[PDB]
Amino acid sequence: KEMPQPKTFGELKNLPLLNTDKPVQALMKIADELGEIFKFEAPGRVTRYLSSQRLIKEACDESRFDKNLSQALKFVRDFAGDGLATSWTHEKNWKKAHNILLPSFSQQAMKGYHAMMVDIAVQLVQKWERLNADEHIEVPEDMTRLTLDTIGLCGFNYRFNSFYRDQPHPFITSMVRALDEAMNKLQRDDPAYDENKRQFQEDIKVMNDLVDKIIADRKASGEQSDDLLTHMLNGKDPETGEPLDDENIRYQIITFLIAGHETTSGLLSFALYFLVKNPHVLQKAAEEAARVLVDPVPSYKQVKQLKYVGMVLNEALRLWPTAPAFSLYAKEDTVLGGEYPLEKGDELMVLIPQLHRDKTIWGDDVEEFRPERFENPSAIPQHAFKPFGNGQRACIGQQFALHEATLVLGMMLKHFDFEDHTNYELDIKETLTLKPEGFVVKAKSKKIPL
Amino acid sequence: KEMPQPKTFGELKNLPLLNTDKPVQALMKIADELGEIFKFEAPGRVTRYLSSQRLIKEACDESRFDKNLSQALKFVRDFAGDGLATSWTHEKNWKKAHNILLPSFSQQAMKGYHAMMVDIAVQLVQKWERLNADEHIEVPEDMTRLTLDTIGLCGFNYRFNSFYRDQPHPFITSMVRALDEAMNKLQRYDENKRQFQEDIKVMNDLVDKIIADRKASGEQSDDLLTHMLNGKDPETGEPLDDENIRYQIITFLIAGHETTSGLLSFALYFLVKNPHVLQKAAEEAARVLVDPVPSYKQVKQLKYVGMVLNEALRLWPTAPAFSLYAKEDTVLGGEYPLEKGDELMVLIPQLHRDKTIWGDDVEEFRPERFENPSAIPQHAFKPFGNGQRACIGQQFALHEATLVLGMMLKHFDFEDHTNYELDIKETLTLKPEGFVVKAKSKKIPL
Ligand code: HEM
Ligand code: HEM
């Protein structure tokens, strides 16, 4: 009945606990100490962090709980607008954009994006083929180059050309700096932050200007590509009969870049980390890649046949889900788990890394990397594995992310042997997402042509 | 390109090769002679037996192959109906029952079945504790008593009371005789037909009566029957009807009892033939089972016992084959073209003897092979089938077998007093016929 709570700081209550550069990992340690639920209080804010499948499966009851905009999402909304990820379910533009965009993100829709994904994947492979002896790979950096260029190409047929640059495209610099300012605001307004504010508005203008120009350029030409922008310029919501307006389309494009690039590149980086730390898994995954990817360019159907590669990605998502939490609110008065009464509007946070370590679901070996857990998807209980959120507010880009990640990891395993030449010590950097900072490897080419 | 084929008998093609009392072992000997794939022809039937991990890993591609009802499963369907094991993947009742029954067969669901499993396991231990000096144990007979009573209790709260009987419960007599008739038809009668129909009515009547009794009672138990009476398929929103529920309960008894008792019998056989392995498993049992009654969590900690069971399943998988058909035209192993509908048989005991996977010591019993599942190549170990048509009772069988074997190793030392010579009887399943041991109690109370 009584709910545990971490240590407090006088008037600031629990808020200073978030004044750390690894807040998700700090919250995981608190969940280890306090259990399946703990209260987190701040000035004018109260929330509850859930860690057990028992309680999270109730929180995922859409008849009782809806998606809440966390403080992080509220700050991101200042440039993501009423895009899909930062809009309330009851806002007209959520259901409208959801209905219009759901078919463009289906598994069948990945057939149309496949060629553009291969374009960037081949650039990644060619970069590593052209490395000199004893040179190494900066894994999260190159994975971020890939995912960002892939969403740029599939999103609105724009080439950031990250593999031609040391310093990223100005749009990316502003987006990254905008996300940093939004996240820094959480653990933070005195007059000294006036420089942060002016820079924040400058970065927002950079993002809007480029995206608005591309939309305007596309409308003035009438050209039709295989990208999401063409789909949004021609799509109509069956319910309202309306299309997305130019402003919301911009917010959707910004959202795809934010919500998609860093989560997906982290997944690829974590997957390669776990593969080089578990050579038996790497051998098993590389064997499948060699057997399935028999052509110089992988086909869509071949990517679907990379079952074990997909198992590797799911197990990487189990241990380190790169979008590590989502927020919910109680639609009405209700009782959670038969002992925690909640009032209408009360907030809940789902700590996904803790859910994925619930020993009552996964057994005692929760910390071991074993893709064989996902050998048969039916053995996974309901709401035990939630790397892509829940219900109608689940990740719309799930099939996009998993197809890109399966394609790229498969090509990496086909074309190179990998060496953990530094015996890299896992150090997880936290931004809006999670990534293994400083993860480096050496790649020895198998000399297989593209 | 050209596919090997065993010796033929004129118009009957390969069919007389199955007119033997050990057909699986005969097929293993053919695979030893002909290799990883051979064609098997009969009047109006063509199938292909696969034995190598190289080809079977392709056959397990669910985008290219689906479960086929072998001739044996088709005959079992005459009393198992459209239960999970004898239904086609495209039948509405398969996916419906699959969605409904999957949560009640999960690892988490074993926590709720554990107490009933302990109930029967304690009866087995007490039977052996009460044997007189120089009396011996008939191993497959007692293991079948245990597994059959365990599924009766966990399945629908029914006590066959096999440890109170010499002659089995009348339902079991009809079930065994029905399975015998189905298998004899493969290698094959008005008396057989009338008897076959008599046994089907016996099985249906008892199961249907228990269902009606449960519905007429309204009581809620921790058994599979309760889950099926209240469960709804999330997809269609529909529950299983009473007739299909009958086929499911009949299926659990058929598909579960003899496969699991065979696993226990083969496991004990291999342990008494390998005293160093037996000592290792017995040491683990004593260290883990520190309470008079094993807990669910303690069974999960019997790691080496579980490896013993997996290695027993490697050498003698008690469900020794399954059948597949090609969903479309496809090429197997880059040299064997197959047309849509072409049938494949997976010879599991031969797959598990692939030296390219397990090394040269394939015939040696070494549970250490299973220390790391990640070191085992894909689709090399398939004692429970494949994919969405894999054994739904896998966690049930392994939990029961780990619990019972663990208690056996804790409470008794075992003697191979006859120096038993392995003789594998073939029914729907495999078992070591005539396997007997002596048990000397360690005098540890329950
Ligand atoms: C491994 C990669 C990814 C992970 C782990 C991930 C995770 C998530 C999670 C947990 C949510 C729900 C957040 C909440 O409830 O507040 C979400 C929502 C969303 N994601 Fe992803 N995501 C990934 C990749 C992508 C990609 C590639 C795209 C776009 C191309 C994308 C676009 C979105 C959108 C638009 C939403 C909001 C959906 C809605 O509310 O209608 N994500 N994602
Ligand atoms: C060591 C013991 C067992 C072994 C070796 C075993 C083996 C198998 C195999 C190989 C299959 C696939 C057959 C095919 O593909 O045609 C299968 C399916 C099945 N088994 Fe088991 N089994 C065992 C125990 C059990 C138990 C205890 C139960 C029930 C409590 C059970 C119920 C089933 C069912 C319902 C199916 C069909 C699943 C479906 O297609 O939806 N089995 N089993």
mmCIF file with all atom_site columns, N, CA, C and O and ligand atoms in Angstrom, chain A residues 67 73 84-85 94 98 105 151 255-256 259-260 263-264 267 317 322-323 325-327 352 386-389 392-397 400-401, ligand 1:
data_model
loop_
_atom_site.group_PDB
_atom_site.id
_atom_site.type_symbol
_atom_site.label_atom_id
_atom_site.label_alt_id
_atom_site.label_comp_id
_atom_site.label_asym_id
_atom_site.label_entity_id
_atom_site.label_seq_id
_atom_site.pdbx_PDB_ins_code
_atom_site.Cartn_x
_atom_site.Cartn_y
_atom_site.Cartn_z
_atom_site.occupancy
_atom_site.B_iso_or_equiv
_atom_site.pdbx_formal_charge
_atom_site.auth_seq_id
_atom_site.auth_comp_id
_atom_site.auth_asym_id
_atom_site.auth_atom_id
_atom_site.pdbx_PDB_model_num
ATOM   1   N  N   . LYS A 1 67  ? -1.400 7.689  -23.229 1.00 0.00 ? 67  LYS A N   1
ATOM   2   C  CA  . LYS A 1 67  ? -0.053 8.245  -23.271 1.00 0.00 ? 67  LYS A CA  1
ATOM   3   C  C   . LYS A 1 67  ? -0.031 9.648  -22.679 1.00 0.00 ? 67  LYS A C   1
ATOM   4   O  O   . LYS A 1 67  ? -0.856 10.497 -23.030 1.00 0.00 ? 67  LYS A O   1
ATOM   5   N  N   . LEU A 1 73  ? 9.233  15.086 -23.343 1.00 0.00 ? 73  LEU A N   1
ATOM   6   C  CA  . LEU A 1 73  ? 8.454  15.222 -24.572 1.00 0.00 ? 73  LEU A CA  1
ATOM   7   C  C   . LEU A 1 73  ? 7.866  16.622 -24.705 1.00 0.00 ? 73  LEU A C   1
ATOM   8   O  O   . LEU A 1 73  ? 7.771  17.158 -25.815 1.00 0.00 ? 73  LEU A O   1
ATOM   9   N  N   . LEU A 1 84  ? 3.649  13.190 -34.465 1.00 0.00 ? 84  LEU A N   1
ATOM   10  C  CA  . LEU A 1 84  ? 3.039  12.001 -33.872 1.00 0.00 ? 84  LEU A CA  1
ATOM   11  C  C   . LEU A 1 84  ? 3.550  11.734 -32.460 1.00 0.00 ? 84  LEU A C   1
ATOM   12  O  O   . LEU A 1 84  ? 2.775  11.348 -31.576 1.00 0.00 ? 84  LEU A O   1
ATOM   13  N  N   . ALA A 1 85  ? 4.847  11.939 -32.219 1.00 0.00 ? 85  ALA A N   1
ATOM   14  C  CA  . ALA A 1 85  ? 5.435  11.533 -30.949 1.00 0.00 ? 85  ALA A CA  1
ATOM   15  C  C   . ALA A 1 85  ? 5.161  12.510 -29.814 1.00 0.00 ? 85  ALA A C   1
ATOM   16  O  O   . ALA A 1 85  ? 5.195  12.101 -28.647 1.00 0.00 ? 85  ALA A O   1
ATOM   17  N  N   . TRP A 1 94  ? -3.241 14.126 -34.055 1.00 0.00 ? 94  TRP A N   1
ATOM   18  C  CA  . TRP A 1 94  ? -2.634 12.815 -33.838 1.00 0.00 ? 94  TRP A CA  1
ATOM   19  C  C   . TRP A 1 94  ? -3.343 11.745 -34.658 1.00 0.00 ? 94  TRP A C   1
ATOM   20  O  O   . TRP A 1 94  ? -2.719 11.054 -35.471 1.00 0.00 ? 94  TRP A O   1
ATOM   21  N  N   . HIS A 1 98  ? -1.908 9.820  -37.758 1.00 0.00 ? 98  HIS A N   1
ATOM   22  C  CA  . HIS A 1 98  ? -1.802 8.380  -37.539 1.00 0.00 ? 98  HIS A CA  1
ATOM   23  C  C   . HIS A 1 98  ? -2.483 7.602  -38.661 1.00 0.00 ? 98  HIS A C   1
ATOM   24  O  O   . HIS A 1 98  ? -1.889 6.692  -39.249 1.00 0.00 ? 98  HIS A O   1
ATOM   25  N  N   . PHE A 1 105 ? 4.090  3.039  -43.159 1.00 0.00 ? 105 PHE A N   1
ATOM   26  C  CA  . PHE A 1 105 ? 5.074  2.442  -42.262 1.00 0.00 ? 105 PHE A CA  1
ATOM   27  C  C   . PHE A 1 105 ? 4.878  0.941  -42.086 1.00 0.00 ? 105 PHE A C   1
ATOM   28  O  O   . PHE A 1 105 ? 5.513  0.343  -41.208 1.00 0.00 ? 105 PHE A O   1
ATOM   29  N  N   . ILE A 1 151 ? 16.997 7.893  -42.972 1.00 0.00 ? 151 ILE A N   1
ATOM   30  C  CA  . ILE A 1 151 ? 15.705 8.530  -42.734 1.00 0.00 ? 151 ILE A CA  1
ATOM   31  C  C   . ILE A 1 151 ? 15.578 9.803  -43.565 1.00 0.00 ? 151 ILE A C   1
ATOM   32  O  O   . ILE A 1 151 ? 14.480 10.152 -44.015 1.00 0.00 ? 151 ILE A O   1
ATOM   33  N  N   . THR A 1 255 ? 10.076 14.933 -36.708 1.00 0.00 ? 255 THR A N   1
ATOM   34  C  CA  . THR A 1 255 ? 9.853  13.854 -35.747 1.00 0.00 ? 255 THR A CA  1
ATOM   35  C  C   . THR A 1 255 ? 10.536 12.564 -36.192 1.00 0.00 ? 255 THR A C   1
ATOM   36  O  O   . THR A 1 255 ? 11.186 11.886 -35.388 1.00 0.00 ? 255 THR A O   1
ATOM   37  N  N   . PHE A 1 256 ? 10.403 12.210 -37.473 1.00 0.00 ? 256 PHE A N   1
ATOM   38  C  CA  . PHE A 1 256 ? 11.058 11.000 -37.968 1.00 0.00 ? 256 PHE A CA  1
ATOM   39  C  C   . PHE A 1 256 ? 12.558 11.053 -37.716 1.00 0.00 ? 256 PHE A C   1
ATOM   40  O  O   . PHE A 1 256 ? 13.166 10.052 -37.316 1.00 0.00 ? 256 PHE A O   1
ATOM   41  N  N   . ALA A 1 259 ? 12.904 10.928 -33.606 1.00 0.00 ? 259 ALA A N   1
ATOM   42  C  CA  . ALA A 1 259 ? 12.464 9.670  -33.019 1.00 0.00 ? 259 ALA A CA  1
ATOM   43  C  C   . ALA A 1 259 ? 13.167 8.461  -33.620 1.00 0.00 ? 259 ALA A C   1
ATOM   44  O  O   . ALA A 1 259 ? 13.216 7.409  -32.976 1.00 0.00 ? 259 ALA A O   1
ATOM   45  N  N   . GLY A 1 260 ? 13.716 8.586  -34.824 1.00 0.00 ? 260 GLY A N   1
ATOM   46  C  CA  . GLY A 1 260 ? 14.204 7.421  -35.535 1.00 0.00 ? 260 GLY A CA  1
ATOM   47  C  C   . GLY A 1 260 ? 15.705 7.235  -35.616 1.00 0.00 ? 260 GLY A C   1
ATOM   48  O  O   . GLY A 1 260 ? 16.186 6.099  -35.613 1.00 0.00 ? 260 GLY A O   1
ATOM   49  N  N   . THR A 1 263 ? 17.586 6.276  -31.774 1.00 0.00 ? 263 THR A N   1
ATOM   50  C  CA  . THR A 1 263 ? 17.144 4.971  -31.294 1.00 0.00 ? 263 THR A CA  1
ATOM   51  C  C   . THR A 1 263 ? 17.692 3.845  -32.160 1.00 0.00 ? 263 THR A C   1
ATOM   52  O  O   . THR A 1 263 ? 18.157 2.819  -31.643 1.00 0.00 ? 263 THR A O   1
ATOM   53  N  N   . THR A 1 264 ? 17.631 4.009  -33.485 1.00 0.00 ? 264 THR A N   1
ATOM   54  C  CA  . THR A 1 264 ? 18.041 2.937  -34.384 1.00 0.00 ? 264 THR A CA  1
ATOM   55  C  C   . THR A 1 264 ? 19.555 2.782  -34.416 1.00 0.00 ? 264 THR A C   1
ATOM   56  O  O   . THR A 1 264 ? 20.065 1.656  -34.430 1.00 0.00 ? 264 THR A O   1
ATOM   57  N  N   . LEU A 1 267 ? 20.613 0.957  -31.317 1.00 0.00 ? 267 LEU A N   1
ATOM   58  C  CA  . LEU A 1 267 ? 20.337 -0.473 -31.431 1.00 0.00 ? 267 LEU A CA  1
ATOM   59  C  C   . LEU A 1 267 ? 21.438 -1.184 -32.208 1.00 0.00 ? 267 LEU A C   1
ATOM   60  O  O   . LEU A 1 267 ? 21.922 -2.244 -31.794 1.00 0.00 ? 267 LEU A O   1
ATOM   61  N  N   . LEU A 1 317 ? 17.707 -5.114 -27.891 1.00 0.00 ? 317 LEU A N   1
ATOM   62  C  CA  . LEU A 1 317 ? 16.641 -4.236 -27.419 1.00 0.00 ? 317 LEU A CA  1
ATOM   63  C  C   . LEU A 1 317 ? 16.142 -4.631 -26.035 1.00 0.00 ? 317 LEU A C   1
ATOM   64  O  O   . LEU A 1 317 ? 15.655 -3.773 -25.288 1.00 0.00 ? 317 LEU A O   1
ATOM   65  N  N   . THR A 1 322 ? 16.617 1.490  -26.565 1.00 0.00 ? 322 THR A N   1
ATOM   66  C  CA  . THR A 1 322 ? 17.222 2.793  -26.814 1.00 0.00 ? 322 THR A CA  1
ATOM   67  C  C   . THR A 1 322 ? 16.261 3.961  -26.617 1.00 0.00 ? 322 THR A C   1
ATOM   68  O  O   . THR A 1 322 ? 16.719 5.101  -26.513 1.00 0.00 ? 322 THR A O   1
ATOM   69  N  N   . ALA A 1 323 ? 14.954 3.714  -26.551 1.00 0.00 ? 323 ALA A N   1
ATOM   70  C  CA  . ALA A 1 323 ? 13.992 4.705  -26.074 1.00 0.00 ? 323 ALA A CA  1
ATOM   71  C  C   . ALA A 1 323 ? 13.490 4.194  -24.731 1.00 0.00 ? 323 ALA A C   1
ATOM   72  O  O   . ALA A 1 323 ? 12.446 3.530  -24.663 1.00 0.00 ? 323 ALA A O   1
ATOM   73  N  N   . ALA A 1 325 ? 11.998 4.788  -21.882 1.00 0.00 ? 325 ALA A N   1
ATOM   74  C  CA  . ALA A 1 325 ? 10.833 4.988  -21.032 1.00 0.00 ? 325 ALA A CA  1
ATOM   75  C  C   . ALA A 1 325 ? 9.726  5.664  -21.825 1.00 0.00 ? 325 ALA A C   1
ATOM   76  O  O   . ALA A 1 325 ? 9.975  6.337  -22.828 1.00 0.00 ? 325 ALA A O   1
ATOM   77  N  N   . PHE A 1 326 ? 8.495  5.466  -21.356 1.00 0.00 ? 326 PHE A N   1
ATOM   78  C  CA  . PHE A 1 326 ? 7.357  6.232  -21.836 1.00 0.00 ? 326 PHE A CA  1
ATOM   79  C  C   . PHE A 1 326 ? 6.421  6.491  -20.667 1.00 0.00 ? 326 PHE A C   1
ATOM   80  O  O   . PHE A 1 326 ? 6.481  5.819  -19.634 1.00 0.00 ? 326 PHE A O   1
ATOM   81  N  N   . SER A 1 327 ? 5.554  7.484  -20.841 1.00 0.00 ? 327 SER A N   1
ATOM   82  C  CA  . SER A 1 327 ? 4.741  8.015  -19.758 1.00 0.00 ? 327 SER A CA  1
ATOM   83  C  C   . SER A 1 327 ? 3.264  7.778  -20.035 1.00 0.00 ? 327 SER A C   1
ATOM   84  O  O   . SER A 1 327 ? 2.825  7.769  -21.190 1.00 0.00 ? 327 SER A O   1
ATOM   85  N  N   . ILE A 1 352 ? 11.548 0.807  -19.131 1.00 0.00 ? 352 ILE A N   1
ATOM   86  C  CA  . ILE A 1 352 ? 11.645 -0.370 -20.003 1.00 0.00 ? 352 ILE A CA  1
ATOM   87  C  C   . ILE A 1 352 ? 12.845 -1.255 -19.680 1.00 0.00 ? 352 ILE A C   1
ATOM   88  O  O   . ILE A 1 352 ? 12.676 -2.486 -19.638 1.00 0.00 ? 352 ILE A O   1
ATOM   89  N  N   . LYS A 1 386 ? 8.688  -4.570 -24.413 1.00 0.00 ? 386 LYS A N   1
ATOM   90  C  CA  . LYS A 1 386 ? 8.049  -3.342 -24.900 1.00 0.00 ? 386 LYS A CA  1
ATOM   91  C  C   . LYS A 1 386 ? 9.064  -2.297 -25.370 1.00 0.00 ? 386 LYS A C   1
ATOM   92  O  O   . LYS A 1 386 ? 9.002  -1.135 -24.965 1.00 0.00 ? 386 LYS A O   1
ATOM   93  N  N   . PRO A 1 387 ? 10.003 -2.667 -26.248 1.00 0.00 ? 387 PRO A N   1
ATOM   94  C  CA  . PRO A 1 387 ? 10.973 -1.668 -26.719 1.00 0.00 ? 387 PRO A CA  1
ATOM   95  C  C   . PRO A 1 387 ? 10.355 -0.605 -27.609 1.00 0.00 ? 387 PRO A C   1
ATOM   96  O  O   . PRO A 1 387 ? 10.978 0.443  -27.819 1.00 0.00 ? 387 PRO A O   1
ATOM   97  N  N   . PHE A 1 388 ? 9.156  -0.840 -28.144 1.00 0.00 ? 388 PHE A N   1
ATOM   98  C  CA  . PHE A 1 388 ? 8.505  0.088  -29.059 1.00 0.00 ? 388 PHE A CA  1
ATOM   99  C  C   . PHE A 1 388 ? 7.229  0.694  -28.478 1.00 0.00 ? 388 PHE A C   1
ATOM   100 O  O   . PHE A 1 388 ? 6.372  1.166  -29.233 1.00 0.00 ? 388 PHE A O   1
ATOM   101 N  N   . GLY A 1 389 ? 7.091  0.703  -27.156 1.00 0.00 ? 389 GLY A N   1
ATOM   102 C  CA  . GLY A 1 389 ? 5.935  1.336  -26.550 1.00 0.00 ? 389 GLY A CA  1
ATOM   103 C  C   . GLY A 1 389 ? 4.724  0.421  -26.542 1.00 0.00 ? 389 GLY A C   1
ATOM   104 O  O   . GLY A 1 389 ? 4.834  -0.806 -26.604 1.00 0.00 ? 389 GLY A O   1
ATOM   105 N  N   . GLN A 1 392 ? -2.003 1.829  -29.396 1.00 0.00 ? 392 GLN A N   1
ATOM   106 C  CA  . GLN A 1 392 ? -2.106 2.724  -30.542 1.00 0.00 ? 392 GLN A CA  1
ATOM   107 C  C   . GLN A 1 392 ? -1.041 3.810  -30.519 1.00 0.00 ? 392 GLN A C   1
ATOM   108 O  O   . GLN A 1 392 ? -0.791 4.436  -31.554 1.00 0.00 ? 392 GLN A O   1
ATOM   109 N  N   . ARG A 1 393 ? -0.420 4.055  -29.365 1.00 0.00 ? 393 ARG A N   1
ATOM   110 C  CA  . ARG A 1 393 ? 0.688  4.995  -29.248 1.00 0.00 ? 393 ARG A CA  1
ATOM   111 C  C   . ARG A 1 393 ? 2.042  4.297  -29.311 1.00 0.00 ? 393 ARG A C   1
ATOM   112 O  O   . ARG A 1 393 ? 3.052  4.873  -28.890 1.00 0.00 ? 393 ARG A O   1
ATOM   113 N  N   . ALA A 1 394 ? 2.080  3.067  -29.816 1.00 0.00 ? 394 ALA A N   1
ATOM   114 C  CA  . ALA A 1 394 ? 3.348  2.388  -30.026 1.00 0.00 ? 394 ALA A CA  1
ATOM   115 C  C   . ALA A 1 394 ? 4.109  3.033  -31.184 1.00 0.00 ? 394 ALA A C   1
ATOM   116 O  O   . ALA A 1 394 ? 3.572  3.827  -31.959 1.00 0.00 ? 394 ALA A O   1
ATOM   117 N  N   . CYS A 1 395 ? 5.382  2.667  -31.297 1.00 0.00 ? 395 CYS A N   1
ATOM   118 C  CA  . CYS A 1 395 ? 6.250  3.219  -32.328 1.00 0.00 ? 395 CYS A CA  1
ATOM   119 C  C   . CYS A 1 395 ? 5.715  2.904  -33.718 1.00 0.00 ? 395 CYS A C   1
ATOM   120 O  O   . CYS A 1 395 ? 5.582  1.735  -34.090 1.00 0.00 ? 395 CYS A O   1
ATOM   121 N  N   . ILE A 1 396 ? 5.405  3.952  -34.486 1.00 0.00 ? 396 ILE A N   1
ATOM   122 C  CA  . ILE A 1 396 ? 4.957  3.741  -35.855 1.00 0.00 ? 396 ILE A CA  1
ATOM   123 C  C   . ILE A 1 396 ? 6.111  3.328  -36.760 1.00 0.00 ? 396 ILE A C   1
ATOM   124 O  O   . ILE A 1 396 ? 5.880  2.767  -37.836 1.00 0.00 ? 396 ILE A O   1
ATOM   125 N  N   . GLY A 1 397 ? 7.352  3.574  -36.344 1.00 0.00 ? 397 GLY A N   1
ATOM   126 C  CA  . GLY A 1 397 ? 8.507  3.262  -37.162 1.00 0.00 ? 397 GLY A CA  1
ATOM   127 C  C   . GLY A 1 397 ? 9.161  1.934  -36.833 1.00 0.00 ? 397 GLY A C   1
ATOM   128 O  O   . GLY A 1 397 ? 10.321 1.710  -37.191 1.00 0.00 ? 397 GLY A O   1
ATOM   129 N  N   . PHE A 1 400 ? 10.169 -0.038 -39.907 1.00 0.00 ? 400 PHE A N   1
ATOM   130 C  CA  . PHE A 1 400 ? 11.261 0.693  -40.545 1.00 0.00 ? 400 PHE A CA  1
ATOM   131 C  C   . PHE A 1 400 ? 12.576 0.450  -39.813 1.00 0.00 ? 400 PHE A C   1
ATOM   132 O  O   . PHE A 1 400 ? 13.591 0.102  -40.431 1.00 0.00 ? 400 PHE A O   1
ATOM   133 N  N   . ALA A 1 401 ? 12.573 0.636  -38.490 1.00 0.00 ? 401 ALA A N   1
ATOM   134 C  CA  . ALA A 1 401 ? 13.794 0.478  -37.706 1.00 0.00 ? 401 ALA A CA  1
ATOM   135 C  C   . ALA A 1 401 ? 14.323 -0.948 -37.774 1.00 0.00 ? 401 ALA A C   1
ATOM   136 O  O   . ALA A 1 401 ? 15.531 -1.163 -37.924 1.00 0.00 ? 401 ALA A O   1
HETATM 137 C  C1  . HEM C 2 .   ? 15.099 0.800  -32.541 1.00 0.00 ? 1   HEM C C1  1
HETATM 138 C  C2  . HEM C 2 .   ? 14.551 1.955  -32.936 1.00 0.00 ? 1   HEM C C2  1
HETATM 139 C  C3  . HEM C 2 .   ? 13.330 2.611  -32.242 1.00 0.00 ? 1   HEM C C3  1
HETATM 140 C  C4  . HEM C 2 .   ? 12.866 2.457  -30.987 1.00 0.00 ? 1   HEM C C4  1
HETATM 141 C  C5  . HEM C 2 .   ? 13.429 1.583  -29.841 1.00 0.00 ? 1   HEM C C5  1
HETATM 142 C  C6  . HEM C 2 .   ? 11.690 3.293  -30.841 1.00 0.00 ? 1   HEM C C6  1
HETATM 143 C  C7  . HEM C 2 .   ? 10.928 3.418  -29.699 1.00 0.00 ? 1   HEM C C7  1
HETATM 144 C  C8  . HEM C 2 .   ? 9.737  4.104  -29.578 1.00 0.00 ? 1   HEM C C8  1
HETATM 145 C  C9  . HEM C 2 .   ? 8.879  4.146  -28.410 1.00 0.00 ? 1   HEM C C9  1
HETATM 146 C  C10 . HEM C 2 .   ? 9.148  3.416  -27.073 1.00 0.00 ? 1   HEM C C10 1
HETATM 147 C  C11 . HEM C 2 .   ? 7.824  4.916  -28.698 1.00 0.00 ? 1   HEM C C11 1
HETATM 148 C  C12 . HEM C 2 .   ? 6.643  5.261  -27.765 1.00 0.00 ? 1   HEM C C12 1
HETATM 149 C  C13 . HEM C 2 .   ? 7.049  6.482  -26.941 1.00 0.00 ? 1   HEM C C13 1
HETATM 150 C  C14 . HEM C 2 .   ? 5.938  6.953  -26.034 1.00 0.00 ? 1   HEM C C14 1
HETATM 151 O  O1  . HEM C 2 .   ? 5.002  6.165  -25.744 1.00 0.00 ? 1   HEM C O1  1
HETATM 152 O  O2  . HEM C 2 .   ? 6.005  8.123  -25.579 1.00 0.00 ? 1   HEM C O2  1
HETATM 153 C  C15 . HEM C 2 .   ? 7.979  5.392  -30.055 1.00 0.00 ? 1   HEM C C15 1
HETATM 154 C  C16 . HEM C 2 .   ? 7.110  6.212  -30.734 1.00 0.00 ? 1   HEM C C16 1
HETATM 155 C  C17 . HEM C 2 .   ? 7.309  6.705  -32.002 1.00 0.00 ? 1   HEM C C17 1
HETATM 156 N  N1  . HEM C 2 .   ? 8.374  6.424  -32.836 1.00 0.00 ? 1   HEM C N1  1
HETATM 157 FE FE1 . HEM C 2 .   ? 9.888  5.112  -32.478 1.00 0.00 ? 1   HEM C FE1 1
HETATM 158 N  N2  . HEM C 2 .   ? 11.475 3.936  -32.042 1.00 0.00 ? 1   HEM C N2  1
HETATM 159 C  C18 . HEM C 2 .   ? 12.457 3.542  -32.927 1.00 0.00 ? 1   HEM C C18 1
HETATM 160 C  C19 . HEM C 2 .   ? 12.587 3.957  -34.236 1.00 0.00 ? 1   HEM C C19 1
HETATM 161 C  C20 . HEM C 2 .   ? 11.758 4.837  -34.896 1.00 0.00 ? 1   HEM C C20 1
HETATM 162 C  C21 . HEM C 2 .   ? 11.838 5.217  -36.293 1.00 0.00 ? 1   HEM C C21 1
HETATM 163 C  C22 . HEM C 2 .   ? 12.907 4.666  -37.268 1.00 0.00 ? 1   HEM C C22 1
HETATM 164 C  C23 . HEM C 2 .   ? 10.851 6.101  -36.534 1.00 0.00 ? 1   HEM C C23 1
HETATM 165 C  C24 . HEM C 2 .   ? 10.467 6.838  -37.844 1.00 0.00 ? 1   HEM C C24 1
HETATM 166 C  C25 . HEM C 2 .   ? 10.919 6.520  -39.061 1.00 0.00 ? 1   HEM C C25 1
HETATM 167 C  C26 . HEM C 2 .   ? 10.123 6.290  -35.293 1.00 0.00 ? 1   HEM C C26 1
HETATM 168 C  C27 . HEM C 2 .   ? 9.036  7.113  -35.105 1.00 0.00 ? 1   HEM C C27 1
HETATM 169 C  C28 . HEM C 2 .   ? 8.193  7.123  -34.014 1.00 0.00 ? 1   HEM C C28 1
HETATM 170 C  C29 . HEM C 2 .   ? 6.953  7.866  -33.901 1.00 0.00 ? 1   HEM C C29 1
HETATM 171 C  C30 . HEM C 2 .   ? 6.363  8.789  -34.991 1.00 0.00 ? 1   HEM C C30 1
HETATM 172 C  C31 . HEM C 2 .   ? 6.427  7.619  -32.694 1.00 0.00 ? 1   HEM C C31 1
HETATM 173 C  C32 . HEM C 2 .   ? 5.105  8.170  -32.112 1.00 0.00 ? 1   HEM C C32 1
HETATM 174 C  C33 . HEM C 2 .   ? 3.961  7.273  -32.578 1.00 0.00 ? 1   HEM C C33 1
HETATM 175 C  C34 . HEM C 2 .   ? 2.624  7.826  -32.149 1.00 0.00 ? 1   HEM C C34 1
HETATM 176 O  O3  . HEM C 2 .   ? 2.485  8.183  -30.953 1.00 0.00 ? 1   HEM C O3  1
HETATM 177 O  O4  . HEM C 2 .   ? 1.696  7.902  -33.000 1.00 0.00 ? 1   HEM C O4  1
HETATM 178 N  N3  . HEM C 2 .   ? 10.705 5.509  -34.321 1.00 0.00 ? 1   HEM C N3  1
HETATM 179 N  N4  . HEM C 2 .   ? 9.158  4.881  -30.560 1.00 0.00 ? 1   HEM C N4  1
#
